[PDB]
Design a protein around this ligand. Structure first.
Ligand SMILES: O=[N+]([O-])c1ccc2[nH]c(Cc3ccccc3)nc2c1
Ligand SMILES: O=[N+]([O-])c1ccc2[nH]c(Cc3ccccc3)nc2c1
Lengths: 259, 258
């Protein structure tokens, strides 16, 4: 699964557009560039391997890597429209049925990740990438699951239990909460909590049970989805449903009500 | 008297900061291996030079010795002695079964070192496992490889969040907090707050009383050291003891128990 730096051409923009020589268009995240010094290549390759095993239509695929002297890159597949929040904020308003697919696809991808024991610690619209006809893939662009590559805002989507208790081990129910807030954002066409003055006031407000304003959302969003996000953003973790539990009810709903 | 030229060295080669800090390994024409920290490539020449002399005057077996300074043209660098095993955390991860008596040794020596530094009016503004260097026989020396505690050398240059005191997220109790987490780190064999996902999350968390998980630790670490780290990471900086206060209780405890 290895690659070379000579294989790619220039690139715009370090996240950059990597025109491969033969295979064509991809995106290159150069994680390190400099002296050479990096001693622990072995762990980097095994965790590239460990995240190469994640194979799904609804998850971003590691195309390859570059491990050479003064450069370290993760090569992933190009997604034409960018991230989800960019799509929503784009001047055309997306219809209900497309938003339905997006949501079902997010559920599919997460269920797969949770199937493989990978809890996403940072699920948010910036990690949901979109292709030309609105099909999505889930990424981890901050490398929160890849210890070693990291060794080379978000808070709106963080579950109460993790706020002011960093030793709490993330569970499946941590990103179900983040899913809830993604749902809001999908029908709100913007980031949540825009009226807050203090960030510390917000964090304590969120701990004590405050959530994004649904009053803004009732016009454009069906009731079954509004109930879903409230279930998912419960203060109690056990109160929240699993992704398979969401899938089982949301798939028949999407198919029969949204197309 | 302590000045060195670039041409005194044959070659230099960068080191991994995970193991050795932000440093290069150089070879002195007549003196062999040294580690060189190039900080920059007239302004504040006089202050920088005297600060180097301030750290040249730090002479203690458990503290890093400055060996020279390069100040020339567009290059300012510091030179220090070579420590082969690298920093503490690098050794703790590679050396699996580091026994209780050796970890006691290292803790006593960190305490010796810090009390000396404070005795010279030097407050470590960034104590952490990556600033604790290890020689071949597992003895330690305290360093400030970021040069946080030297006003002018840090500016020239212009990890830590885990060890910084909550009030600062510098008095004689600031680095007592850092030391507390070093104690945890020593018996945990790893950096703290592994589950923390965001910077700002971690800053508010620690600020409201969150601390490293002792449950990933209880069995390897003696109960007096658990009391010591709990005291040293109190939210209130007056509740924390001093390094001489710590040295007096820990020295005999090392001798009789470990
Ligand atoms: O360079 N990158 O930024 C990058 C590269 C490959 C990726 N593969 C995924 C999918 C994924 C994996 C693990 C948990 C959740 C999602 N994200 C990636 C991000
Ligand atoms: O090349 N360097 O970067 C370097 C050189 C000499 C040093 N001497 C100390 C000792 C010290 C100072 C202040 C607080 C604690 C310990 N650190 C050094 C770092």
């Amino acid at each position: 699964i290895k690659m070379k730096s000579s294989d790619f051409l220039e690139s715009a923009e370090k996240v950059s557009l990597a025109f491969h020589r033969t295979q064509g268009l991809m995106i290159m995240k150069t994680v390190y560039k400099g002296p050479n010094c990096i001693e622990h290549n072995e762990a980097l390759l095994e965790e590239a391997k460990m995240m190469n095993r994640l194979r799904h239509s609804r998850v971003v695929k590691l195309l390859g890597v570059i491990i050479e002297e003064g450069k370290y890159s993760l090569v992933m597949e190009y997604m034409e429209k960018g991230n989800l929040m960019h799509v929503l904020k784009a001047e055309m308003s997306t219809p209900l049925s497309v938003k339905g697919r997006i949501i079902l696809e997010i559920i599919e991808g997460m269920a797969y990740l949770h199937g493989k024991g990978v809890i996403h610690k940072d699920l948010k619209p910036e990690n949901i990438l979109v292709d030309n006809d609105f099909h999505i893939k889930i990424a981890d662009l901050g490398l929160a699951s890849f210890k070693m590559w990291s060794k080379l805002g978000t808070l709106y989507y963080m579950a109460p239990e993790h706020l002011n208790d960093v030793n709490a081990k993330p569970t499946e129910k941590s990103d179900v909460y983040s899913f809830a807030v993604v749902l809001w954002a999908i029908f709100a066409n913007k980031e949540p909590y825009e009226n807050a003055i203090a960030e510390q006031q917000l964090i304590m407000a969120i701990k004590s049970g405050n959530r994004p304003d649904v009053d803004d959302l009732t016009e454009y969003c069906p009731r079954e989805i509004i109930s879903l996000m409230k279930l998912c953003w419960e203060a109690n973790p056990e109160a929240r449903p699993t992704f398979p539990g969401i899938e089982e009810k949301f798939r028949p709903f999407y198919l029969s009500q949204l197309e």
